Amino acid sequence: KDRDELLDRCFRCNQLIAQLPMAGDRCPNCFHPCVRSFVNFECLPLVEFVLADELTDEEAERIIVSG
């Protein structure tokens, strides 16, 4: 019986990580890599999203500043 407070939480799938993660430290459920700190290695509440092909990083910063 494992405690749930010491288990990593994948915020993308909104489900806990009970099994051992696969390569890349990805989520067992939704294959999401864990956005971890690099002192205590805790999965920070961050999800990774990539811009669509019609948006660029310069355009992403422009639309972030504008709205």
């Binding site: 700190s37 690099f38 002192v39 205590n40 961050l46 999203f49």
Partner: protein, 80 residues
Amino acid sequence: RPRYGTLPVPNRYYRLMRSDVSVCLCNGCQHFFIAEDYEAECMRGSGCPLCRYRPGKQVSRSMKQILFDMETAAAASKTS
């Protein structure tokens, strides 16, 4: 922004939804940290624990510090 140098690499984007946790990003390393934990680990006299980045000064330091260190080494040699 992955600081690989002058090479073109696209900027990755992340979304934060739970504001109760304080996160930071070491500009010399571009790795995510807990802000308070990173601050506490910075006090060991070597900046970021991974990349040893020190804020408040540019990438090129004042390398005259090395000259004074060699001066102090000569002084410690000439103490006795």
